[PDB]
Symmetry: C2
Amino acid sequence: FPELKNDTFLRAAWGEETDYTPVWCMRQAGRYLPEFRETRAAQDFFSTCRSPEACCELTLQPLRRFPLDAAIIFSDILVVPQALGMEVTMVPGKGPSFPEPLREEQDLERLRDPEVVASELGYVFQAITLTRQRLAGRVPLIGFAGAPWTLMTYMVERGGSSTMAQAKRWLYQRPQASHQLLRILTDALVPYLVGQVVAGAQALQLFESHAGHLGPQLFNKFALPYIRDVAKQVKARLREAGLAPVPMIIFAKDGHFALEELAQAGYEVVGLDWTVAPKKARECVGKTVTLQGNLDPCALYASEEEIGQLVKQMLDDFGPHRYIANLGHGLYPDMDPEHVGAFVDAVHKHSRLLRQ
Amino acid sequence: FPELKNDTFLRAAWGEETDYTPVWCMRQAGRYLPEFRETRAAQDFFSTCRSPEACCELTLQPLRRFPLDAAIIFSDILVVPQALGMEVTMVPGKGPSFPEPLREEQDLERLRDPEVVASELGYVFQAITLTRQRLAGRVPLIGFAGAPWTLMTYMVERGGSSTMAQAKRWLYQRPQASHQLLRILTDALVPYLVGQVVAGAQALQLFESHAGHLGPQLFNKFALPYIRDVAKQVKARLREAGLAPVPMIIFAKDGHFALEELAQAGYEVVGLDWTVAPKKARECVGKTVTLQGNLDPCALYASEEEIGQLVKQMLDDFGPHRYIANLGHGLYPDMDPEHVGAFVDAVHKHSRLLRQ
């Protein structure tokens, strides 16, 4: 692969001092871009996913508009449960879902052996290699996957609820089966993530998007062990394969209660939602880990001038060290591209000021 | 009205020591009771609401099953926006909603003067008086309403989203109109809540159910001022009318970031969701205010024996002083009544132990 030109994101991720604060946006490749919708309709969501060229194209689209300091491969977190053998339907406007969710312990018998999952996800590896070659070292490429608990919520609920009452019912009524499902997911994720890195990912983000539905007690029993296990095993396999381990980011949305624990889970970066004040996040995590986040994405509905001020304050709160700017969640589809550009420009402009 | 026999809830609420920990459940009157569904179908949700006798009956139903230490009047938070002139439809299975939400600043012109709202909500006052008379002093009766921000989210979205992106778009793009709507809601709530107390409510809970969608910055601008204003003005009007002020409870669901502020907002009790560890909540709030909560309601899917242990631990964490047991959110409709009874019995049993 070509030599990386801008590595600011990787240096920040490892904790090193940098000349400015690197920035990227969750869902930078998303429906808020007209060119994204255009390209999506050229297949059918997952036929888009399954085309390496299509996934590479959607990944690069934002980088043609904005000087983002990383790219993230376009895919979806549900590719994993699909590769385990759950059927998915694209609901037009209403999103990828499982029409037959896991309902009881017996339903685990329909899942593939997790050890075969990586062979099922070869299309994603191909997209990663292609995107790494086409980026030509401009900025690093981040790979990703959903975290075990969160993937579990999608498998058991049908998809997204507002309570995860059904998922949480599993935890309380079927703890043994829950742990079984979570181990299967873990054992599938590890080879998928190692594979992304073999294919050419230069960092990895684990999305624990549905963390907030758990309180501390359930989270420490059912989410945290698997989060730790994913990091430990990925690092080990990479070492053993002769490869350099990559910075890993854990993002637990609505996970204020777990930040202390997450900072000692084997991840270089803890990503934050917008409900946590940066100074309190820094208190909770300590000074080794890097923080990523955390602007309210709805802040981009404000004026460009207002976005600049909100960014200035966010940066003052985080300070220059151990920090990667991002939003506190993914961009929404009605957002204005030029407001995304303002965000990016503002991070770069004010972070330089803050330094000298 | 009859002399209150069991006032444990009120004493805890004011901070006084008690012989045991009082307990009640958000949505104790709810679909998890078969007798609730039975009685609901005898009208049509809001024709139930509008019948004082029907609302009184649903309020008492839980107290016939369980030795709860308070009753809460059955109504809904959307009665306020309805009384302001928004039309509501009961979607069968899918819940009360607004088919014509406020879309822009001009739509505020359709709302009634907030000063007339209390006259529109006379049915609720009648239900309160009736329920206070029929309870015959067994336990105190709690009145309630939605908080201004949260009611705003229902008026602007159509009802419940997952992002409140549209509500938050108002805050960022239409700050002046947002503040206008929030003042209207505040000015309507104050007389409604005073009226509930005049009708015979012995405590009041404000439900800021959608707090978590805001981070600190937006919350301090758009939610907190109105929360404070509601408490200050209710207390004033009651004083002025020659009446005793009642303990007031603020419950901000997903409001971990605001607890410090909420403990100095003029409320005797801060109610907690299940994502906050009780010991950290006590750190944030200090030792004047009473805490209420906070068991994960899904915990009731566990065995009766497990509920007892989870309750034991919850009580050890909160300690005996300044504490009212409750769930961290409302009961879900698939829950088992006998598991609610276990919760209640466990609070009473272990709180007595914890004391001597």
